[PDB]
Each structure stands twice: as structure tokens, then as C-alpha cells.
Amino acid sequence: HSLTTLGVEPSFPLHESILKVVEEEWQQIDRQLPSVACRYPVSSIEAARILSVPKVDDEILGFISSTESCDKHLDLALCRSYEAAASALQIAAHTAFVAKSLQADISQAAQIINSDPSDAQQALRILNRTYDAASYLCDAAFDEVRMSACAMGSSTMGRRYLWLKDCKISPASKNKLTVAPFKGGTLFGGEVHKV
Amino acid sequence: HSLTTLGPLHESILKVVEEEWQQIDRQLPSVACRYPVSSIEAARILSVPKVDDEILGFISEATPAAATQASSTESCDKHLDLALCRSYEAAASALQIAAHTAFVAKSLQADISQAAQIINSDPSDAQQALRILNRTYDAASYLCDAAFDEVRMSACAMGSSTMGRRYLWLKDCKISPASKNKLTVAPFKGGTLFGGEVHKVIKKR
């Protein structure tokens, strides 16, 4: 009857908690990306290499060794976008595995319930596991949301530096415009009183 | 007990990522039909932010013009802006999918408990529980599908990020334009920005 878990026990409106998650990440778009290493462990050396931010080949660096400040900021933005997306992928990968196990468990319980509705205790034990898996999936979905919000914030931060790189305004005004909170809609939000 | 749904796990995930990476400079697939979202709020959030005319006008007026320089970064700049826009869009799409995933996950858990109560009370209602479980079975496959779509969107974002960085790092790289073109459009393989193609143009120490 009352199962239990250690976790959370033509229009599709956006959930209010999703909006809140996005808005809070966007209050400070230039921050470190949350690690997902402990909750969504990467399952292999291959995935591991493919998930890490790709390095600039030494071969290319050999042929290189005042927008340099811009160049570093743009690189950082792109690196964070990649990192936020890699994390979302790691989570999605975990979700796939869980969705699958949950599916196998449902069939199992169905098979028990069918073979004479009396082995309730067994089927109810299996359902208790599925219920937990469902809670986990809902939590994983909110983590995916958070990562997307971070990726969107980094993209935005990058475009802010890019669009201000050639105009002649004090570093103060440029910095103010670049770190300002983001609300979606427009790139700079709208510092009406720039001067 | 015959459950059904109308339409190498790790291997499958790798395949999708690799397929998207064969052409990193490409338009993103739409999620509007499969993962529709509504509200003035989500519309503002999901669309790539645009530069406002008052800020754009201000930037322009503060942008000096003359002959001299001649080295207009315009090209590179457009490539970088496109990469960051695509990164935003790929992420926003993954967000729409995630939103649906939260909804389905929560619905699935309410159904599981409903089935639990049925078989907990008078087990005789086997067919009743089976119909509830048949629905949870579908929701679970939906979730697996959504997870693969999220993986796809993430791979696209990573591809776009990598494209942006290839243009950024080749900018002041003292190599010919033909070599730069080749490295930039090469398939992305992970590990390094140009790995898999780099050696075909520059040997290592």
C-alpha cells in the first residue's frame, strides 16, 4: 500500500520548481559547475576520455608558442558549456540504465501478480524497488535541468564577452555588463542606465 | 503479464555520441513535437537570448571605424557566436526533455503506489493492477527514450563547444589556411580538439 523511499516520496506548462532552479543558477552565471562525479559515476575509461573537456593538441600549441583577455574568457565559456553538457550526458546515461532496470522489475512484478494474486508480499517488495527507482529518476531529471541552466549561463557569458570585445567602453562598464544576472530573453538583461 | 509498449546499453550511448560528432557543424534537431512546452515564462527561457537594440546601438556607437586594421575578425566572431548559440539551444532542448522526464517519473511513481494498494487490498483485482502496471511499463520505456534524446542533445552541445574552440585556437596558429580548414571540419573524436586528424597535417615530437 504505502511504499517508501530514501528520496522524494494541448499545453505542458513549465513546472515552477524547474523555473526556480534555472533562475537561481542564472543569478551568478560565472561560477563553478557542480560536480556529478559522486552521484553519477562514469562507467568506463572510454566514456571518461570522451566526457572530459578536450585539450588543445600539443601539435597546434607548437605553432602558436589586445583581445587576449577576451580569448581566455571565450575559451572558458566554451569549456564550461562542454563540461555542463558532459555532466548532463553522464546523468542521462545513468537514467537510461535505471529506466531499463525499472522496466525489468515491472515485468517481473506483473508476472508474479498474474501467477495467482496471492504472492503479494513478493510483488510488493519488487514494487518498493520500482517506486525508489522512480523517485531517483525524478531527482536525476532536476539535476539534468540544473546542468542545462549552467550550460545556458556559460553560453550567455561567452556571448557577452564576444559582443563587447571591440567597442570602446571602460573595463568597469564592460565587467558590470558581463557579470550581471541573466533572466533569459535578452543577452544583457538591460542595464538601462549604462552611463 | 504480457506487457507491451508502442515503440549493449553503454555501446548504444557511445554510438549516438559518435554519430553526432561526425559532423559537429550542423543544425540541431527539434524537440518541439516530441517534448512540447508552454508558458510565457518557458518561452523567454528556452529561446537563445537576443541582443537588444539599445545595447546594440550603444555598442555600435562605441565601435571606432577607419581603414588601418583591415583584419576584421568578423568571420571568426560569427563562428564563435554560432557555436555559443547552438550550445545554448542544445542545452535548452535537453531542459525541455528533462522537464518531461520529471513529469513522467512522478506520474510513474503515483501509478506504482496505486498498483501496490490494489494488490495489497483485495489481490483478486489482478487485471486492475496489470493495467496500472502496463501503463508504468510504457512510462519506463518513454524514460529510456528521453534519456537517449538527452544524450543526443548533450553530444550536440559538446560538438558545438568544440567547433567554437577549434576556430578560437586556430586563429593565431601559424599554419596555412588549407590546413586550418581541414582541422576545423574534421570529425570530433573526444580527447583532444583535433585528435584523429591532427597527425595528417602536423607530426608530433
Contact B14 A50 (CB under 8 A): yes
Contacts of A58 (CB under 8 A, 6+ apart): B204, B205
C-alpha dist (Å) from residue B200 to A147, B75, B171, B182: 36, 25, 19, 10
Resolution (A): 2.2
What φ, ψ does residue B86 adopt, rounded to 5°? -65, -35
Q: How many A/B residue pairs have CB atoms within 8 Å?
A: 362
- What is the C-alpha to C-alpha distance for residues B137 and B146, in angstroms, rounded to an integer? 14
Count Cβ atoms below 10 Å from residue A127 Cβ, excluding itself.
27
Q: Could you say which of B3, B170, B183 has the minimum Cβ distance to residue A106? A: B3
Cell numbers standing for residue A47: 566514456
What does A68-112 look like in DSSP terms, one character per residue? HHHHHHHHHHHHHHHHHHHHHHHHHHHHHHHHHHHHHHHHHHHHH
Chosen from A102, A119, A125, A147 to mutate, greatest number of chain B CBs within 10 A: A102
Flag if B192 and A57 touch (Cβ within 8 Å).
Answer: yes
Burial-class residue B152 by CB neighbours within 10 Å (0-12, 13-18, 19+): buried
Contact B44 A183 (CB under 8 A): yes
Question: Ramachandran region of residue B196, left (φ > 0), alpha (ψ -120 to 50) or beta?
Answer: left
Reported as half-sphere exposure (CB side, CA atoms, 13 A), residue B181 has a value of 3
d(C-alpha B43, C-alpha B178), whole Å: 42
Count Cα atoms within 13 angstroms, Cβ side, for A38.
2
Cα distances from B99 to residues A25, B10, B95, B147, in angstroms, run 16, 24, 6, 12
- Kindly state the DSSP code that residue A11 receives in the 8-state scheme: -
* Burial state string for B59-80 with b = 16 or more CB within 10 A and e = fewer than 16: beeeeeeeeeeeeebeeebebb
Contact B112 A130 (CB under 8 A): yes
Does A190 sit within 8 Å of B102, measured CB to CB? no
Amino acid at B8: P
Give the list of residues 6+ apart from residue B93 with CB closer than 8 angstroms, or none. Answer: B28, B29, B30, B31, B35, B153
Say if residues B49 and A186 touch (Cβ distance below 8 Å): yes
Q: Which of B1, B36, B98 lies nearest to residue A145, judging by beta carbons?
A: B98
> Is A187 strand, coil or helix?
coil
Asked if A49's CB is within 8 angstroms of B99's CB, the reply is no
Judged on CB neighbours under 10 Å (0-12, 13-18, 19+), B18 is middle
Which of B60, B80, B99 is the closest to A74 by Cβ? B80
Complete domains list, chain A, with CATH: 14-181 (1.10.287.3160)
Q: Among B166, B91, B159, B31, which Cα is nearest to A154's?
A: B91
Tell me whether residues B126 and A114 touch, CB distance under 8 A.
yes
Which chain A residues have a beta carbon less than 8 Å from that of B124?
117
Q: Are A156 and A29 in contact, with CB atoms under 8 Å apart?
A: yes
Residue among A115, A129, A144 nearest B101 (CA): A144
Rounded Cα distance, B202 and A62, in Å: 10
CA end-to-end span of chain A: 64
Cell numbers at residue B4, please? 507491451
Whole-angstrom distance, CA of residue A81 vs CA of residue A86:
9
Interface test with B, best of A8, A12, A169 (most B CBs within 10 A): A12
